[PDB]
Amino acid sequence: YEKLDFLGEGQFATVYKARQIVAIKKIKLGHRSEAKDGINRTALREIKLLQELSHPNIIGLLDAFGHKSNISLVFDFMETDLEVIIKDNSLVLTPSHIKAYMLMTLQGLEYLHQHWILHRDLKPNNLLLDENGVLKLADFGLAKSFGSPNRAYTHQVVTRWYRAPELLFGARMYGVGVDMWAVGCILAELLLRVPFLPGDSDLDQLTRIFETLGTPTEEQWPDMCSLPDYVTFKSFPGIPLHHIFSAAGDDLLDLIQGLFLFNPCARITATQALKMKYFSNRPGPTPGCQLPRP
Amino acid sequence: CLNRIEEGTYGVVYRAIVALKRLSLREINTILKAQHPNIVTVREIVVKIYIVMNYVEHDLKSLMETMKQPFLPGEVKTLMIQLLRGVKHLHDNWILHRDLKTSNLLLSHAGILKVGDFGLAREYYTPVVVTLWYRAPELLLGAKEYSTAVDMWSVGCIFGELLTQKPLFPGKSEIDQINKVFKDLGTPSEKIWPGYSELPAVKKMTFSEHPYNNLRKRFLSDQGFDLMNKFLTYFPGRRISAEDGLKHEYFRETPLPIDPSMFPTWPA
Amino acid sequence: MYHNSSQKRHWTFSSEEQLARLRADANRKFRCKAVANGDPVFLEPHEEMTLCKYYEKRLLEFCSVFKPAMPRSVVGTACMYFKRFYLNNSVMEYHPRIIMLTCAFLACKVDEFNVSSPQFVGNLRESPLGQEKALEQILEYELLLIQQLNFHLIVHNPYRPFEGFLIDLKTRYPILENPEILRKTADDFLNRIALTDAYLLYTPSQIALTAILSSASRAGITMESYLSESLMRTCLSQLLDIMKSMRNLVKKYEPPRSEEVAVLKQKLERCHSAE
Amino acid sequence: ALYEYQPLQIETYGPHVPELEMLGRLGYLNHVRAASPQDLAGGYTSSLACHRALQDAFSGLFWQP
Numbered sequence: 001y002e003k004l005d006f007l008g009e010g011q012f013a014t015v016y017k018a019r020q021i022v023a024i025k026k027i028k029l030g031h032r033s034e035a036k037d038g039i040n041r042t043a044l045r046e047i048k049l050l051q052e053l054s055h056p057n058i059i060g061l062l063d064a065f066g067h068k069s070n071i072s073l074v075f076d077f078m079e080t081d082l083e084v085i086i087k088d089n090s091l092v093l094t095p096s097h098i099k100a101y102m103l104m105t106l107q108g109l110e111y112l113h114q115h116w117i118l119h120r121d122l123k124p125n126n127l128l129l130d131e132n133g134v135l136k137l138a139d140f141g142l143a144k145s146f147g148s149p150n151r152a153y154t155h156q157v158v159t160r161w162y163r164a165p166e167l168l169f170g171a172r173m174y175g176v177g178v179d180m181w182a183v184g185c186i187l188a189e190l191l192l193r194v195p196f197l198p199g200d201s202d203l204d205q206l207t208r209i210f211e212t213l214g215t216p217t218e219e220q221w222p223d224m225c226s227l228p229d230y231v232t233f234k235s236f237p238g239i240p241l242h243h244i245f246s247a248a249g250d251d252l253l254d255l256i257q258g259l260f261l262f263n264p265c266a267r268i269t270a271t272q273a274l275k276m277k278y279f280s281n282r283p284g285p286t287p288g289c290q291l292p293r294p
Numbered sequence: 295c296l297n298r299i300e301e302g303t304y305g306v307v308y309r310a311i312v313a314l315k316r317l318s319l320r321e322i323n324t325i326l327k328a329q330h331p332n333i334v335t336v337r338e339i340v341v342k343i344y345i346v347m348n349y350v351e352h353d354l355k356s357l358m359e360t361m362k363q364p365f366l367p368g369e370v371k372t373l374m375i376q377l378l379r380g381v382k383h384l385h386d387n388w389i390l391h392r393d394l395k396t397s398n399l400l401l402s403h404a405g406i407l408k409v410g411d412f413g414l415a416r417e418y419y420t421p422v423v424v425t426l427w428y429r430a431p432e433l434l435l436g437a438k439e440y441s442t443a444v445d446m447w448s449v450g451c452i453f454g455e456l457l458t459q460k461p462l463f464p465g466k467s468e469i470d471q472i473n474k475v476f477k478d479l480g481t482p483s484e485k486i487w488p489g490y491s492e493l494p495a496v497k498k499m500t501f502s503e504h505p506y507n508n509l510r511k512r513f514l515s516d517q518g519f520d521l522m523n524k525f526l527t528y529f530p531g532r533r534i535s536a537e538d539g540l541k542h543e544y545f546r547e548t549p550l551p552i553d554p555s556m557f558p559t560w561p562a
Numbered sequence: 563m564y565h566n567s568s569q570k571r572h573w574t575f576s577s578e579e580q581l582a583r584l585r586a587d588a589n590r591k592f593r594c595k596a597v598a599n600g601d602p603v604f605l606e607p608h609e610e611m612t613l614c615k616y617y618e619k620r621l622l623e624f625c626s627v628f629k630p631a632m633p634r635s636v637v638g639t640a641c642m643y644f645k646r647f648y649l650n651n652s653v654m655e656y657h658p659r660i661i662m663l664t665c666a667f668l669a670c671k672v673d674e675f676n677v678s679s680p681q682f683v684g685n686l687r688e689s690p691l692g693q694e695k696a697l698e699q700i701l702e703y704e705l706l707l708i709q710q711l712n713f714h715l716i717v718h719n720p721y722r723p724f725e726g727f728l729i730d731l732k733t734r735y736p737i738l739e740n741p742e743i744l745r746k747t748a749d750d751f752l753n754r755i756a757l758t759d760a761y762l763l764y765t766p767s768q769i770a771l772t773a774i775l776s777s778a779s780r781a782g783i784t785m786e787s788y789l790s791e792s793l794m795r796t797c798l799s800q801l802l803d804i805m806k807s808m809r810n811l812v813k814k815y816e817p818p819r820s821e822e823v824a825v826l827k828q829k830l831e832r833c834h835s836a837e
Numbered sequence: 838a839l840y841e842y843q844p845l846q847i848e849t850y851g852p853h854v855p856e857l858e859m860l861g862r863l864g865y866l867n868h869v870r871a872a873s874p875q876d877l878a879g880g881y882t883s884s885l886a887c888h889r890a891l892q893d894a895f896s897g898l899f900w901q902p
């Protein structure tokens with residue numbers, strides 16, 4: 001593994017290229033108290049998660065070499081992200097491209113959720129596109145298993161822009177819905193090329209959500225008040241769905257509405273979403289080799 | 295480099311005695327413009343980009359964590375004097391720090407408090423700044439404009455932390471933080487707070503009512519209470535300033551501010 | 563899930579012959595390394611197995627009185643890590659005490675059981691100097707354990723399958739008046755299966771079913787009808803043979819001998835002091 | 838090239854487990870702990886716990902190394 005280029009840096013670790021071409025994510029030590037912990041918990045979590053997972057639309061972990069100080073992971077070279085595609089104004093996103101991206105994301109999440117695992121960090125730059133246009137989920141640092149009523153994790157996991165109202169209202173226990181809403185947000189971004197609800201504060205995020213989709217009632221959320229961080233809101237009428245996305249068809253409107261129910265139990269899942277009439281409708285989703293490339 | 299003292303999201307500091315912080319233009323310009331005895335003194339600039347600072351032995355939060363007895367009032371008053379001098383120097387230089395917390399405060403063996411972490415400082419804005427445990431209600435309720443009151447609140451909260459060695463409003467969440475502030479101080483009103491209805495949060499949300507001035511049960515002299523209420527004035531235009539706080543009668547009481555030199559030693 | 567997992571693909575073996583040959587290979591490898599470095603001080607593989615069993619019991623005792631309370635999944639994962647590590651390594655190279663401590667630490671980290679290092683060592687019956695020394699050794703050997711596990715850090719335990727089988731018996735078996743009375747005894751039997759190496763030979767669902775059926779047979783309740791109809795000829799025979807092998811392994815297991823473990827511990831200390 | 842959904846199939850090497858939508862019909866959820874309204878608000882139901890328990894009970898039951 002001959003390091004040859006620098007690919008960026010984040011809060012979890014530092015990533016750089018290497019000769020097949022791969023990418024090493026080397027983990028830096030945490031805080032002073034976290035330096036005594038040893039191997040970083042995010043890295044161990046991601047190691048086990050990608051060791052127990054195998055799917056064409058999930059990033060592939062190859063090697064996890066390291067030394068005493070910390071650990072370093074190795075992944076396949078991922079050409080670009082989805083955020084690059086979205087933010088690039090030179091790239092025209094035909095409805096087929098949106099259909100293909102949503103199809104890949106939904107299939108990956110279907111496989112992930114079948115094994116009782118929540119990504120909890122869904123957002124466009126986390127969806128990586130290869131040289132063959134194969135979208136793969138990544139950044140499994142926050143990915144945690146779900147189903148057992150024993151372990152409850154922090155609600156403050158997803159970023160503020162793509163956080164479901166169940167998480168924003170401080171829910172200890174949740175299910176697949178926390179992913180699905182994020183997916184919908186991504187879908188909305190693919191329809192507008194700008195963040196759907198780009199709130200700065202989390203309360204402002206809630207205001208944006210309720211101003212765009214209308215304030216939920218007890219009919220659409222039977223136990224909304226039961227949440228501990230539940231805050232009362234004024235009844236916004238909510239913009240009709242066809243006004244926000246004028247170019248989206250009726251099936252796409254139904255898919256978006258299903259992805260954007262306020263009740264997490266009634267919110268559609270990956271299998272249900274793949275079974276909607278939108279994906280089988282004309283035109284067919286674009287192949288991997290015909291997706292836009294920067 | 296000798297050892298990494300601590301890790302940060304946008305900058306990591308090593309010990310070398312000096313401190314080498316690896317990270318931009320905003321922070322370096324703000325730190326350069328505010329050279330002062332009570333402000334972190336940058337020695338030079340080297341190149342990733344690195345900033346060299348005069349090494350301090352400890353910070354306030356680490357000292358509080360690893361010490362059992364409470365603060366003696368004299369050193370509390372001395373630290374408040376130094377903090378007020380520093381924030382007034384920042385205010386005179388038209389600098390808003392918005393990152394005042396016990397972690398940022400650095401205390402040396404000589405009893406000198408020397409603020410730093412100018413990543414969130416700006417020239418006077420950005421809607422969401424300041425940590426949740428010290429953020430002012432105006433920025434909590436989505437006020438697009440703010441002033442020195444945001445640093446004044448942080449100073450008041452730091453004073454409250456000094457008094458009891460525990461955060462005043464350690465809100466679990468933003469809604470929880472607002473609820474904690476309202477419960478401990480009393481919910482604001484239009485009569486108390488002019489321009490209340492204009493706040494974006496109130497226009498689109500409803501809160502609960504609480505009795506006024508419930509913070510006294512948590513704790514301080516009567517002049518200490520007056521100065522504390524001066525910190526916890528709801529109205530941003532009515533909240534006291536550092537210059538007037540220095541002129542307050544609480545700084546002249548029976549436990550007079552002890553000099554920085556007479557400071558009990560702690561492990562390094 | 564187990565049906566496509568690293569544990570099934572790599573860490574489940576045909577029979578005890580593979581386990582014995584792997585342990586003998588590890589012992590021979592360490593002997594060759596020592597003789598190349600520069601004879602009666604090396605312990606035989608059976609003595610290594612005895613010491614491994616004794617220190618597995620010690621790890622069980624450690625996790626029993628751990629504070630905060632260790633979920634059964636965490637201790638199960640720790641035991642599986644211990645067995646996996648000492649299947650391909652020698653007690654004469656890495657000490658069992660520090661290895662079991664680092665196994666418990668890694669199980670706490672993997673199973674999302676957030677406990678700080680001082681908290682993790684506050685349960686150690688050692689001096690504060692002993693506790694911090696144990697901390698340094700654990701930090702040193704955590705990566706070694708990680709590497710020796712082939713980075714397969716997810717371990718499936720039979721407790722969840724046991725709960726699932728109990729639920730299924732409750733709903734779809736009206737013949738059994740109350741499956742609950744068959745839990746506790748089965749739990750005890752499960753503990754026995756922990757002591758033996760059955761974790762490396764049979765999947766957790768079979769282990770849980772074997773424990774439940776052994777508990778049923780001990781109480782005299784016969785439920786072959788559950789397997790025949792509710793669970794719906796080769797498959798039934800294979801399941802029955804697997805249960806028979808489980809019971810044979812449980813019977814055949816022998817607890818350690820105090821004088822034997824004392825002598826083996828002295829010999830092990832001699833080997834570790836020498837090299 | 839159109840698309841038509843194919844339910845992905847992986848062998849569990851064990852007895853068939855009922856589909857998620859219909860556990861409560863046979864009284865499976867009767868013998869589990871009822872989900873509190875706080876969990877129901879966030880989208881958590883006892884159906885998930887029961888289905889996970891049953892899926893892990895019947896997984897790999899018929900496998901031979």
Ligand SMILES: Nc1ncnc2c1ncn2[C@@H]1O[C@H](COP(=O)(O)OP(=O)(O)O)[C@@H](O)[C@H]1O
Nearest residue numbers: 007008009010011012015023075076077078079
């Ligand atoms: N498999 C990969 N192949 C190529 N580049 C990658 C791969 N994974 C991550 N990267 C790059 O490394 C960077 C990682 O930073 P990121 O994960 O965004 O930090 P954070 O998670 O703290 O925001 C990204 O900018 C991305 O472009």
Ligand SMILES: Nc1ncnc2c1ncn2[C@@H]1O[C@H](COP(=O)(O)OP(=O)(O)O)[C@@H](O)[C@H]1O
Nearest residue numbers: 300302303304305307313347348349350353411
């Ligand atoms: N000169 C110094 N003296 C003492 N401690 C310092 C000094 N410089 C930095 N530190 C330590 O480093 C930490 C600040 O890290 P910082 O650079 O603010 O990271 P970030 O900017 O990414 O948040 C503080 O907790 C402080 O204890």
Ligand SMILES: [Mg+2]
Nearest residue numbers: 125126138139
């Ligand atoms: Mg990423």
Ligand SMILES: [Mg+2]
Nearest residue numbers: 302398411413
């Ligand atoms: Mg800082």
